Design a protein around this ligand. Structure first.
Ligand code: BH0
Lengths: 99, 99
């Protein structure tokens, strides 16, 4: 679909069989989700945000559906203002910026 | 032009007679740039996300040239680690998300 930016580019995503609202974020290198349960082991990772660096839990090869498009990749879990879909998953769903 | 997301979508903008590199961020409500001087009055604002919050100065009615497109909008100036072009100006250049 084509998404204009007058409002926040929020879409429905599905992970672990659960529907969630998330933000299509082109300025985010990685996908960062609010505290939730994910299977497997996780690795430690640092991501730099507007106010500084934080620790997050990295889960790799996670299945997630973004606005109807299925993807499989790295998902980071930590304190975040909103569920963020970063470039690693936007590329998987073929999302591009246009003007 | 169509911009893919394999890398951060970085463009050159022209503001206040200065050329800067910036990140087109659909996840940012506002345009926030590193410390710089801007004409006119300003009001203090607080913005947050990953890492927390930072205080910035809000300047309204500021002209900016993005990818050759002359847009007018609000610009926040503060200790951000990266120059960010937010939705308030992305809309003015007709930037959309597609997949
Ligand atoms: N909608 C929405 C929304 C609201 C509050 C916070 C948010 S948000 O927290 O994702 N957000 C917008 C993100 O695009 C992103 C912007 C960024 C800041 C510093 C360095 C790199 C990138 N970022 C950090 C980040 C980095 C990597 C990653 O993998 C995920 C996230 C960030 O700090 N934001 C604050 C920010 C708030 C308001 C602005 O005008 C500009 C920036 C989104």
């Amino acid at each position: 679909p084509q998404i204009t930016l007058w409002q926040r580019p929020l879409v429905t995503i599905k992970i672990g069989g659960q529907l969630k609202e998330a933000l299509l974020d082109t300025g985010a290198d990685d996908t960062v989700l609010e505290e939730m349960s994910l299977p497997g082991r996780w690795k430690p990772k640092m991501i730099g945000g507007i106010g500084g660096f934080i620790k997050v839990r990295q889960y790799d090869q996670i299945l997630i559906e973004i606005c109807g498009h299925k993807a499989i990749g790295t998902v980071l879990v930590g304190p975040t203002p909103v569920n963020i879909i970063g470039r690693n998953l936007l590329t998987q769903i073929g999302c591009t910026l246009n003007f």
